[PDB]
Amino acid sequence: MIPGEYHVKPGQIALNTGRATCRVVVENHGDRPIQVGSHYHFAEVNPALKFDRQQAAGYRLNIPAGTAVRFEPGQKREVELVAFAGHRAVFGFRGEVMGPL
């Protein structure tokens, strides 16, 4: 007996199903580490990360909500992106879109 214990049924949860995704190779050209959150508009991340910003337009990291991907200086890796939903309007970040798309 453990007070308030969970009895989680085994299996897996499929995240962000039925949505467009794309893979991109990213490389940190900066001298300091960069960490990106799950819902940040990838196309507007720190300018030191080199990748096809055009392909990442309207996309975010396809990872469980609240988690992140870290890039140490000089680190190169391929990430999977998932398209934004809702109104597909981007406001904030580096202020590059500030509107629909």
Partner: protein
């Protein structure tokens, strides 16, 4: 991508199909539904989801909620579901999916710059409890009840006076006015009960016009057929509730005479089992009638090994009885019956008894209404197994039936369900957040009208709020004007119209009671059973349809020694 169910539960709390143990009891609840879109759950913290342009939108205050409880496991009479809860203007705005509509799908609860966040992942959220049997013996009772998870207190009293020690009555206009004024200082919603023991209607109308939301008929002030009829006549014309503590002595008649005096009119019977007061030994037979809304006080819940032993002296002090006077001790003993005490637990499990209350400091424990209600559910599962209504391998239905006993049912009985009693849109945001391991025992957060009013708090000078010693301390929602804005003082329709709030210069929000005469047993959520119940005059045995109703006393109970320092 993909994530395992266990890892998922650790991050966002359980989802559909997962089961959770309630505290250290044998009760397990299973998540029935989850209103989220997997991958779009909102989470707050460093580098999380709720951030500008991401999980937080660009809308003005008018278009977003003031507060959001993220990933909450709701336990209410209507369901056990996983969802985000939005609170706006001190009231429940919506139960759904929170976030930013600009980039997220299915958002029903918009989060903006004006939104505060309470992380409920891994926690259970319930409506605040409602105790309708309060003896206002001391103001300290309000903090004790609030800490237990009770946010509304209905009762009567003027302080530690003999009349209040024994009865839930705030006698007359002067005392009523005084107590309504004092109520502004307390962090719980309050409604008062006047002394209904009189055979002159005008003496009752004055009290209702002064502010009481109900009338208490108590045997200590004379629970005679004439007084009962008078109170009910006034209740019928002023839309207020009557609470009854019948004639234990059978002085004016037996239970059948009292029932006849009531004449099919709506009435709330306090401690229907009898130990707390009532026709000896059959007051319990009242739960068979359609116009009776029956409740239990808590010292007899549940039946345990030490229950009987502690009752005699408790009875005496509560009613100013003299142990040297033979007649006083004989009538105290006729109220304590193992037979009816054991049956009461079963009647609750069957839904024949619809409410639980305390009877604070007058044969009841103010901080143990919720705790004892769950102990009964546990003892009943252990003894009787699954209820006929259960579906699936969980105790979901029994949990819904029991939570209704101290939330929605007391609200319906007293005509305040339009304001509080459950987690439904439009109702006051009185919410209680619990960690599964401490469910029903010690809350993580108690929210009153949209503001946290009390919570466990560690070292004030510490670098974080968690270091020891951690104990309950009043928060901003319990302070001065913020408190007034987050609590309600319930008045009768007559008092409201008479301008009582303006005259007494009451500072808190005002709410009016209504629908006290139209509620009947059939309206009690999950507890509408009207059994063909009988009590043997000689043996005191309780039978329903001829079958003997009984249970065994517990030697050890959950939610007890594992949690309390004393």
């Amino acid at each position: 991508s993909n994530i395992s169910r266990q890892a998922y539960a650790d991050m966002f709390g359980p989802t559909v199909g997962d089961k959770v143990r309630l505290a250290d009891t044998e009760l397990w609840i299973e998540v029935e539904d989850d209103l989220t879109t997997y991958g779009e759950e909102v989470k707050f913290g460093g580098g999380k989801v709720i951030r500008d342009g991401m999980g937080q939108g660009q809308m003005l205050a008018a278009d977003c909620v003031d507060l959001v409880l993220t990933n909450a496991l709701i336990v209410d009479h209507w369901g056990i579901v996983k969802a985000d809860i939005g609170v706006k203007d001190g009231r429940i705005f919506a139960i759904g999916k929170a976030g930013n509509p600009d980039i997220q799908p299915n958002v029903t609860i918009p989060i903006g710059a004006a939104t505060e966040v309470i992380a409920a992942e891994g926690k259970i959220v319930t409506a605040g409890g409602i105790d309708t049997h309060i003896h206002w013996i001391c103001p300290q009772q309000a903090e004790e009840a609030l800490v237990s998870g009770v946010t509304t207190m209905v009762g009567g009293g003027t302080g530690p006076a003999a009349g209040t020690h024994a009865t839930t009555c705030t006698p007359g206009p002067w005392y009523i006015s005084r107590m309504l004024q004092a109520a502004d200082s307390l962090p719980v919603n309050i409604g008062l009960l006047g002394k209904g023991n009189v055979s002159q209607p005008d003496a009752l109308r004055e009290q209702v016009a002064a502010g009481v939301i109900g009338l208490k008929i108590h045997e200590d002030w004379g629970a005679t057929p004439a007084a009962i009829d008078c109170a009910l006549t006034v209740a019928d014309e002023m839309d207020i509730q009557v609470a009854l503590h019948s004639d234990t002595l059978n002085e004016s008649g037996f239970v059948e005479d009292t029932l006849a005096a009531i004449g099919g009119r709506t009435i709330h019977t306090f401690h229907t089992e009898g130990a707390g007061g009532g026709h000896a030994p059959d007051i319990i037979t009242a739960c068979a009638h359609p116009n009776i809304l029956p409740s239990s006080t808590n010292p007899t819940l549940p039946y345990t090994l030490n229950t009987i032993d502690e009752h005699l002296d408790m009875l005496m002090v509560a009613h100013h009885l003299d142990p040297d006077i033979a007649e006083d001790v004989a009538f105290a003993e006729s109220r304590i019956r193992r037979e009816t005490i054991a049956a009461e637990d079963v009647l609750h499990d069957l839904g024949a008894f619809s409410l639980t209350s305390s009877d604070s400091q007058a044969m009841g424990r103010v901080g143990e209404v919720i705790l004892r209600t769950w102990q009964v559910a546990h003892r009943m599962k252990v003894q009787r197994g699954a209820l006929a209504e259960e579906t699936g391998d969980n105790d979901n239905f029994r949990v819904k039936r029991y939570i209704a006993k101290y939330t929605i049912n007391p609200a319906l009985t007293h005509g305040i369900a339009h304001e509080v009693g459950s987690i439904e849109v439009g109702k006051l945001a009185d919410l209680v957040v619990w960690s599964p391991a401490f469910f029903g025992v010690k809350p993580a957060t108690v929210i009153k009208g949209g503001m946290i009013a009390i919570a466990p708090m560690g070292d004030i000078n510490a670098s974080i709020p968690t270091p020891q010693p951690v104990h309950y301390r009043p928060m901003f929602g319990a302070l001065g004007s913020a408190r007034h804005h987050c609590r309600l003082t319930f008045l009768s329709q007559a008092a409201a119209a008479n301008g009582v709030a303006e005259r007494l210069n009451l500072r808190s929000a005002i709410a009016v009671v209504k629908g006290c005469r139209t509620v009947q047993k059939a309206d009690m959520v999950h507890n509408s059973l009207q059994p063909n119940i009988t009590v043997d005059a000689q043996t005191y045995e309780v039978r329903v349809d001829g079958e003997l109703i009984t249970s065994e006393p517990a030697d050890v109970l959950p939610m007890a020694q594992r949690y309390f320092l004393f």
